[PDB]
Amino acid sequence: MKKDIHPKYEEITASCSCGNVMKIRSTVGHDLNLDVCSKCHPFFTGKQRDVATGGRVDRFNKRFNI
């Protein structure tokens, strides 16, 4: 380093919305609690529920009550 030309750098303890406590050295000055980390991100569960938009042919048959 170069003798106090950079921002402060101290260890913090951040946690997820389900716990998953982690220690990451960052420049914040106060820890934070956030959403799902890479462990709990639904990019491998709700993929089908993500590409699901559409549907009117079935939405007419429920209307067709006769």
Binding site: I24, S26, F43
Partner: protein, 177 residues
């Protein structure tokens, strides 16, 4: 560095087993990270470059180097010496810290995430990516900043080929497709 220990304890053996290497030092290894952004708009206002420098100093625990134009061009009306971009180089411990705090938290936070592209190597084992939103980093709290200015991440590795780079980055559970 948790990721450094994970590398030297799992990834080395995994990659030698997967690639049939002769020497332990033949394994591809990531050697540096580069974060930059060429603000472009600094022609008519220098303070925006300083704001960008503060943004990168917050994002990574270093002081950005302000890079000037290499040659003059009349397309965007710039001359030589004009400060245009900002850049930060990370090697070693801070590089591992940024790698972990990117791929474990920052990548999920990007709006409408599907997975980073895998065909985005430069044919020589290196990787590149754009974030398009500086607010996905926890070091930025949506109240200090004034723009949606983005960053370029460039992973420079020892990997001989893009296939080896893909394998090395997938060993770290990189969000590929």
């Amino acid at each position: 560095a948790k990721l450094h220990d994970y590398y030297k304890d799992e990834v080395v053996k995994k990659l030698m087993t997967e690639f049939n290497y002769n020497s332990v030092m033949q394994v591809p290894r990531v050697e540096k990270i580069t974060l930059n952004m060429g603000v472009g708009e600094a022609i008519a206002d220098k303070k925006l470059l300083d704001n960008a420098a503060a943004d990168l100093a917050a994002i990574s625990g270093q002081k950005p180097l302000i890079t000037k134009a290499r040659k003059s061009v009349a397309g965007f009306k710039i001359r030589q010496g004009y400060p245009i971009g900002c850049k930060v180089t990370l090697r070693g411990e801070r590089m591992w810290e940024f790698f972990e705090r990117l791929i474990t938290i920052a990548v999920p936070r990007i709006r409408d995430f599907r997975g980073l592209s895998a065909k985005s190597f430069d044919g020589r084992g290196n990787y590149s990516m754009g974030v398009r939103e500086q607010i996905i980093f926890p070091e930025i709290d949506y109240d200090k900043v004034d723009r949606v200015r983005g960053l370029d991440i460039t992973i420079t590795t020892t990997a001989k080929s893009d296939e080896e780079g893909r394998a090395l980055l997938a060993a770290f559970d990189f969000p590929f497709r």
